[PDB]
Symmetry: D2
Subunit: 121 residues, 4 copies
């Protein structure tokens, strides 16, 4: 499995050691507090009251945890995924990213602690 | 494996089908939005800015997800637990509960979608 | 997980540290060579040609690996079990036993090496 | 997870749907009766008394179950493998093969019933 920290100000995202392969079943658990600028902080689900001003992932609130598997587009992770299987043709290294508008990561703070494990399959 | 919702206004708590046994390893994932009264809603980690006014679990914020195992005291769940082992002598059915002051659940709203599974060991 | 040897001459059987609980999914892999008397040896499947002269397990060949969960009847194991679930709520420690006629274990030789682990459930 | 039969007379071997990947942990359980010629039949461990006359796998008895992972050499399987990790660089589809001398599979009979699964990691 993989365990690490995903910083809110890390625009490129945090590359994990998990390489999702076809047929793999994975489980993710995320926790912690982060912010997209304001002094207030939000959990892995982000800010439910903030407008989407061009986030890297439109299927998740601003300040939420999302991911990219290999070359895929962003995928919502939020508080995590339970025994999850990726869509067809989706594979490669897993990168965890804080959901924010491109180019604005500079004033971000906090981070999410995340566990990723492969389940039986 | 168990999946269900935990209503915030349910003071008694949501009983699952999971019976934790000595040596068991479990993984929990929780998501959703709930409130301990205010119009705003918080994730499974609760409101980090709200004071503790006699919560059922002092190890977690008001509005966070907690649990009891058999006759044990409240245990912080928050966003979930990754391949987690219970303390010695802790066993029995797992009951998921919204962290709030007893007798005040009346004005709660929302719920959490929670998954619980047993891992290999 | 549990790993150990099961001697063919051990009539009482080999008690393991595995405590099977209702709902548990288990996997077992047995290997090795043993005999119920003759000079040659057989695998965990036993002797497919030998007649049943009053074996402790009538659902398995003589010289095969069987087991008991708690105080239940014997259960065929053979080469092992793959993600196996018990016949409705059989509970207790797992005892591995060489399949032979009671009171004749005296001239047995060899043993089986066995791994037992609980799977995700 | 894969489940199928491996015929003793299939020299090419049986291709499974299991693609082994770096870091993968797998469990195999094999059962049944097969023969490399004689009218007798042996289990997945083969004939412990038979000499090696040029078997595809010199680390297992004749009549034993073995496998190939991708372009790797033969690897002993016998009754199976418990939470097993492959040697470095070894990866690719898993092909199950009956252990025998090349060009002699003609007079073989029987088969092995095999279950392959991936464990959590
Ligand atoms: C008003 O609704 C408002 C409050 C705070 C805020 O912060 C910016 O949010 C952007 C994303 O929408 C981006 O992350 C900026 O860097 C933040 O300063 C925007 C709007
Ligand atoms: C203070 O400004 C403040 C105090 C309470 C509150 O809501 C109540 O919180 C209680 C827990 O501390 C309990 O859940 C009550 O039922 C809520 O009404 C908001 C703001
Ligand atoms: C017949 O060919 C035959 C009968 C018995 C035998 O050995 C005995 O088998 C018993 C179980 O059927 C028991 O295990 C005795 O202790 C063995 O001596 C071999 C061949
Ligand atoms: C010696 O007692 C003996 C030799 C061969 C035999 O059967 C053959 O075994 C070969 C492998 O060693 C090969 O599989 C042949 O096709 C078999 O006929 C039985 C006993
Ligand atoms: Ca920002
Ligand atoms: Ca309340
Ligand atoms: Ca005997
Ligand atoms: Ca042959």
């Amino acid at each position: 499995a993989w365990k690490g920290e995903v910083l809110a100000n890390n625009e490129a995202g945090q590359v994990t050691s998990i390489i999702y392969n076809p047929g793999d079943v994975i489980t993710i658990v995320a926790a912690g507090w982060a912010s997209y600028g304001p002094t207030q902080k939000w959990g892995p689900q982000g800010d439910r009251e903030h407008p989407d001003q061009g986030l890297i992932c439109h299927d998740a609130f601003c300040g939420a945890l999302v991911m990219k598997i290999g070359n895929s587009g962003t995928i919502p992770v939020n508080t995590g995924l339970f025994r999850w299987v990726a869509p067809n043709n989706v594979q490669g290294a897993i990168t965890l990213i804080y959901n924010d508008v491109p180019g604005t990561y500079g004033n971000n703070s906090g981070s999410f602690s995340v566990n990723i494990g492969k389940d039986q399959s």
